[PDB]
Amino acid sequence: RESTMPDRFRYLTKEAPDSPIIWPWFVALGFLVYAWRAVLFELSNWRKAAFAIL
Amino acid sequence: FFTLSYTRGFHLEKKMFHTNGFESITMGSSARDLVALTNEALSISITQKKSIIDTNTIRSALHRQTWDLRSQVRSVQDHGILFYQIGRAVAQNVLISNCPIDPIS
Amino acid sequence: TGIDRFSLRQAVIFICATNRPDELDLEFVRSGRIDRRLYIGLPDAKQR
Amino acid sequence: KMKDLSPLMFEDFVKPFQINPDDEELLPHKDRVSYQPVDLRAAPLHRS
Amino acid sequence: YKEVVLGGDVWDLLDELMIYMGNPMQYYEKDVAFVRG
Amino acid sequence: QFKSWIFELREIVREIKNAHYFLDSWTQFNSVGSFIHIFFHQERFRKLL
């Protein structure tokens, strides 16, 4: 495609990607390591309920 | 231009106002012509996810304001007007050191 | 106009055209109001 | 009709002077501009 | 539907207009303007 | 068409970094935040005196 645009500016017409945000995963990691025994409680109940349903 | 770019969190890179870089290419010697240029340059830097403005961003912003988009593009078929522009630009560069140079194409 | 300048409701692109570009006013083609100008010309032999 | 007549062909008048795009070579000049200054005035007459 | 007359500085004008439309609010939060006309 | 929902969400986000009008709890949040911002800055602290 023939265009009247200089070669130096060719990289400036494209939208560069941005790094996605990551700190929700880190505060989630902190909150899950914080409450480990209760999370294991709830996971045990989930597994027992699933096996009772099946 | 500097105080309009700095107020939006965009720090001017320490090479054009630190040297004679962007003084020789800047124009639009009137008000309301620097606001549009500043907005275009900030838009170009935002599309690159950057916060600093280099020489290329200013040049690409100046090129988008004083140039008309055109279809059915054709170039010069007689080299010999190219020498006219080359000589005038060289003379305007060396001799009149206080005047702009429009790009040659 | 009663609306914030920077908002989703103000993300409007104004396309205008004519057949006489030099007939328009000096304060309408000023940058900030009309930024980009596209010039469409007549086709050539293969397009014909 | 003149295809099989072989006329005296004129030389091409509008053939464009062109530069090679990337042939690295010092293309020459004569060495001058061709403009001649306008200075045509007769000598002053006698009995002065 | 004659798409043959569409070429040169038009396919570069449309890309800028889609760039200024796909997410028009990353420009409108930081107080910069579009190509208005 | 899901982009319009995100458009409205972050446009409301833009509006709530302003003081057009909204619920009272967010206004109290912004007022105590502005008080903290005024108090922390020393060049904004002296002009209070």
Side-chain angles (χ1 to χ4, degrees):
Chain A
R1 194 178 37 214
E2 41 207 59
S3 159
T4 79
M5 171 177 183
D7 309 2
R8 329 194 321 176
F9 304 148
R10 204 85 222 175
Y11 70 94
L12 290 165
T13 44
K14 336 160 167 171
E15 211 186 3
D18 41 358
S19 158
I21 201 56
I22 211 56
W23 65 261
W25 297 127
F26 270 16
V27 288
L29 168 66
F31 274 8
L32 63 86
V33 177
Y34 191 56
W36 51 312
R37 312 177 103 115
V39 171
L40 295 189
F41 271 127
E42 165 71 355
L43 287 200
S44 73
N45 317 133
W46 147 248
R47 172 214 289 279
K48 166 204 150 166
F51 272 11
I53 283 312
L54 298 189
Chain B
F1 175 76
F2 171 75
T3 192
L4 256 185
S5 98
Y6 205 99
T7 195
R8 281 123 164 196
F10 285 93
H11 306 288
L12 209 59
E13 198 255 313
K14 279 87 189 181
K15 193 51 82 180
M16 313 56 68
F17 71 96
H18 219 157
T19 74
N20 50 38
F22 92 108
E23 171 275 337
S24 88
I25 59 184
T26 184
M27 261 317 111
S29 275
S30 302
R32 211 182 297 174
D33 216 353
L34 281 187
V35 191
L37 200 140
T38 284
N39 293 14
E40 270 280 353
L42 290 191
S43 311
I44 291 170
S45 44
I46 277 173
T47 63
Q48 230 74 23
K49 265 98 193 187
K50 304 288 240 321
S51 40
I52 62 97
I53 307 171
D54 39 355
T55 54
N56 255 40
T57 298
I58 310 200
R59 293 263 173 73
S60 151
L62 258 161
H63 181 254
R64 284 174 177 185
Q65 293 221 131
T66 76
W67 178 260
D68 300 8
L69 290 318
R70 182 200 327 127
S71 34
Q72 321 284 344
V73 51
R74 47 208 71 258
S75 47
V76 51
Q77 218 54 49
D78 220 296
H79 321 97
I81 318 88
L82 296 191
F83 299 114
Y84 200 104
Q85 299 164 303
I86 287 322
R88 153 276 290 164
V90 160
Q92 244 167 31
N93 199 346
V94 187
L95 295 173
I96 305 309
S97 270
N98 316 67
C99 271
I101 304 193
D102 273 9
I104 319 161
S105 74
Chain C
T1 168
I3 186 148
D4 217 358
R5 160 59 212 146
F6 296 89
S7 40
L8 193 64
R9 299 301 173 244
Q10 215 86 341
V12 159
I13 290 184
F14 169 78
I15 313 167
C16 74
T18 169
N19 306 298
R20 36 200 92 174
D22 309 278
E23 207 267 304
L24 301 172
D25 304 358
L26 259 53
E27 74 275 346
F28 178 81
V29 194
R30 191 162 271 176
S31 196
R33 318 165 167 184
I34 293 296
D35 205 330
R36 306 272 192 275
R37 313 152 302 271
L38 186 68
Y39 294 44
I40 310 175
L42 286 153
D44 72 326
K46 268 298 303 174
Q47 310 189 15
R48 282 203 301 278
Chain D
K1 294 202 82 48
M2 61 214 57
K3 172 213 317 183
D4 55 277
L5 266 163
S6 75
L8 166 147
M9 284 341 307
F10 259 129
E11 90 160 21
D12 202 356
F13 277 16
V14 77
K15 36 196 202 293
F17 160 60
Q18 281 185 345
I19 313 299
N20 213 289
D22 52 351
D23 194 313
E24 178 81 345
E25 202 281 325
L26 267 292
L27 78 150
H29 321 76
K30 27 212 168 297
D31 217 36
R32 201 38 54 176
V33 281
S34 49
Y35 303 88
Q36 326 164 218
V38 180
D39 193 41
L40 259 65
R41 192 180 345 160
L45 287 155
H46 298 65
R47 209 192 290 105
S48 37
Chain E
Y1 68 101
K2 34 198 204 66
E3 85 297 341
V4 280
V5 202
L6 262 204
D9 306 58
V10 171
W11 289 120
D12 295 345
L13 201 59
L14 293 190
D15 298 1
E16 174 175 334
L17 259 57
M18 308 329 115
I19 277 189
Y20 286 3
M21 257 303 320
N23 247 336
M25 161 155 67
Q26 320 179 199
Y27 317 96
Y28 268 54
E29 279 190 359
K30 339 266 175 195
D31 309 274
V32 312
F34 276 168
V35 280
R36 195 59 159 149
Chain F
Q1 82 165 344
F2 186 79
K3 274 304 184 254
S4 149
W5 203 82
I6 313 294
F7 281 3
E8 283 305 318
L9 168 64
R10 303 178 62 157
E11 210 281 324
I12 283 166
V13 162
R14 187 218 66 105
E15 178 144 58
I16 65 156
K17 62 208 91 141
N18 266 99
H20 277 220
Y21 217 96
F22 262 121
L23 300 163
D24 268 304
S25 96
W26 276 120
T27 63
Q28 300 288 322
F29 185 82
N30 312 325
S31 56
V32 295
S34 180
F35 282 155
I36 285 164
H37 176 222
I38 275 180
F39 277 28
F40 213 38
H41 281 195
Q42 54 283 51
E43 77 279 332
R44 270 201 165 98
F45 208 13
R46 202 265 181 275
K47 282 179 175 301
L48 293 201
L49 288 186

